[PDB]
Structure formats: structure tokens, C-alpha cells
Amino acid sequence: ARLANKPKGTIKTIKGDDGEVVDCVDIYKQPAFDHPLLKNHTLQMQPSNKLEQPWHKNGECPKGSIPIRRQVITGLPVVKKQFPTNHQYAVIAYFYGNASLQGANATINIWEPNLKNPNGDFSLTQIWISAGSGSSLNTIEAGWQVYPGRTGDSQPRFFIYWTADGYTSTGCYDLTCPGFVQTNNYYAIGMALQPSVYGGQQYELNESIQRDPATGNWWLYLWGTVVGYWPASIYNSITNGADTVEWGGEIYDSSGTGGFHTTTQMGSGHFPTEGYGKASYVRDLQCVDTYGNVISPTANSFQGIAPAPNCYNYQFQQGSSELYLFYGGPGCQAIA
Ligand SMILES: *[C@@H]1O[C@H](CO[C@@H]2O[C@@H](C)[C@@H](O)[C@@H](O)[C@@H]2O)[C@@H](O[C@@H]2O[C@H](CO)[C@@H](O)[C@H](O)[C@H]2NC(C)=O)[C@H](O)[C@H]1NC(C)=O
Ligand SMILES: *[C@@H]1O[C@H](CO)[C@@H](O[C@@H]2O[C@H](CO)[C@@H](O)[C@H](O)[C@H]2NC(C)=O)[C@H](O)[C@H]1NC(C)=O
């Protein structure tokens, strides 16, 4: 309903034609530098960059600044993020034996799933890169999400997330708290993504996360272009690498049926057996080992997490060049 106040270090504000607002914040005054553990202010400019968005038609951020989406305060609650009672999933997990994976990729099919209860529900698809357990669980997250209560509308939007204590008191979405350090001058996090058409054009969100071996910083690449990094200094268990990578969909059922009796959609809202063009997928299911080798785990190497298979589930499909994970569904019809 209302826009949040402009952040500190805002050099210029660009208003999009559709009501989006972008604050060009001085790269040295971005929220990340307000983190107590980020006293070590040295900004890694590049790992040891144009991405187009519709708001560029109204202006561009000057050099030395980054575009930050202005938050929309809806007045509705934003529930705690949760690693895979009212959350439901169709996710695959790759468990490494130690916290030494140096990166992971995910090419996620974009859709606009429908929400039965738009004021409280959400539906997302993402990667989870983690290390540790319980109070020490650290995560690196990126994907798309439909969450009107948080974002202001029902469009799939690019999001990032992180935690350093299993979501107890650290972490947040995008640049809403000190954590992630954005380096890209053109791409604002939190904007709408183009959804695919049923039986037609398919759109993908390619994301690559790579740990810099010299610094421990986890860099984010979208379609091969640097966006920024999650600093090593904000973490503890994942500073040397990750022990787990998970891919797939998730829904939040604010109706309280545990995700067992809601028609809130996951992926495209169609079950994985409908296939390419109809069901949503994740491809480029790869991670990087300790020695820099890219590994592509086979379908049998993953553990499936689909606690409501009659509502949302997953299915592997061997493509001609790589493995596909189809996932999602329409949910289950509520009882009358
Ligand atoms: C660190 O872990 C790697 C990988 O762990 C294995 O593979 C995972 C996918 C999962 O199934 C784990 O439970 C496995 O233990 C270890 O790499 C293995 O190393 C052995 C030789 O020691 C080799 O024969 C295997 O092929 C390797 N597996 C893979 C997948 O790379 C590695 O040894 C562990 N490091 C230490 C110091 O323990
Ligand atoms: C999959 O992950 C790998 C490993 O992080 C990415 O590989 C890097 O790709 C860039 C661009 O091609 C190269 O310059 C680097 O040398 C690669 N590193 C390694 C260790 O191979 C790869 O780009 C990712 N692919 C996708 C589609 O995200």
C-alpha cells in the first residue's frame, strides 16, 4: 500500500512507469556496510555487467552507485523463511559428505503460479546452498517468488535470502537488512521476471553461485553477469564451502491446511508429468567440488522432499544434454 522511506546514501531516485521505485545508493553506503561483522569495509569490486530491466527507460544509476528497489509496505505479515507446518515442498537435495562444495548452479523456469489466498500465501522456486545444522545452519539462497504480502503484487520476482543461525535472528530477503553486498550498477534485485506461457514461450532464471577461494566471499551471477556477493564475514559454518544443495519449489499455505488442502500453485500449477512447456522445471543441476570440478549428480544421487505428493510433487526427465527436474502442481482441492 505505501512505499518505505528512501535508504541512507541515496544519490538519485528513479520512478518506473508501473509504480516501481529505484534508489541509486552510493556503493559504499549500501545496507551491507551497517553490519557489525562487516567493519572490514574493503569492497571486493570484482571476483578474483549490464542486465536490462524496464525502469532503465526512465533513467540509470550513476557510476559508484547501485540500484535498490524501494520496499512496498503492504501492512500484511511476512512469515519466517524455512529450510526444506504450513509450508509445502517439492525439492531435491544433494547431500555432500563435508562442507567443501565451492558453488552451485540453477536454471529455473519462471512462472506466475496462482495463489488461493493472496494476502498471506506465497509460492517460490529457488536454490538453497547450506552448511551446518540447527542454530548453526548457514544458507545462500536465490530464486523467484510470488508473495503479494511482501512485494506488493502477484508477479514472480527475483529474490535472494541468507541466514547464519538457521533463521533464528539473522538474515533477510534481498537488501532489506545488512548482509549481501551488491556490486552491479544496472540490475535491481526484487523486480518482476517474465513468466512463461502454458504451451508457449518458456523463460528461465539462470543463477550461478561461486565461492572465491582467495576471500571466501560467495559471488552471485545471473545469466553469467556478476550481481554481488554474500561476504564470508557474515557466516560461520559455510565460510569454507557448503555441505548441502537443494533445488525446487515451495508454497506457504496461510489457510492452515498444512499445504494439503489448498489450490495455491507450485511451479506452473501443473504436475511434472505434463512436461516441457506445461510443468515448471529446474535444469543445470550442478555443483563445484573442493578441487574446482563441476559435478552433475545423477537422478539417483538426490533425495526427494515432497511431503504432499497428491498436491505437489517432482519428476526427473533425462534431457539430450542434461538432467531436468520437473516439479510443482495445482495443490489439492479444499473439502466443503
Ligand atoms: C569430502 O566429501 C567428499 C564427497 O563425499 C562423498 O560424496 C557425496 C556425494 C556423498 O555421497 C558423501 O556421503 C560421500 O562421502 C569425499 O570425496 C570422496 O573421496 C573418495 C576418496 O577419499 C572418492 O573415492 C570419492 O569418489 C569421493 N566422492 C565424491 C562424490 O567426490 C571426500 O573424501 C571428503 N573429504 C574428506 C577429507 O573426508
Ligand atoms: C555452472 O557452474 C560452473 C562452476 O561454477 C560455472 O563455471 C564457470 O563458468 C564461467 C563462464 O563460463 C567460467 O569462466 C569459469 O571458469 C567456470 N568455472 C568452473 C570452475 O568451471 C558455470 O558457468 C555454471 N553454469 C551455469 C549455466 O550457471
Residue numbers in the entry: 29 to 76, 86 to 121, 132 to 380, 401 to 403
Sentences from the paper on this structure:
Neprosin from the pitcher plant is a reported prolyl endopeptidase. Here, we produce recombinant neprosin and its mutants, and find that full-length neprosin is a zymogen, which is self-activated at gastric pH by the release of an all-β pro-domain via a pH-switch mechanism featuring a lysine plug. The catalytic domain is an atypical 7+8-stranded β-sandwich with an extended active-site cleft containing an unprecedented pair of catalytic glutamates. Neprosin efficiently degrades both gliadin and the 33-mer in vitro under gastric conditions and is reversibly inactivated at pH > 5.
We crystallized pro-neprosin in an orthorhombic space group and found that the polypeptide was cleaved at the physiological maturation site (P128–S129). The crystals therefore contained the zymogenic complex of the cleaved PD and the CD. We solved the structure by single-wavelength anomalous diffraction, collecting data at the lutetium LIII absorption edge wavelength from a crystal soaked in Lu-Xo440. This soaking led to significant variation in one of the crystal cell axes when compared to native crystals while keeping good diffraction of X-rays. The final refined model of the derivative complex was used to solve the native pro-neprosin structure by molecular replacement.
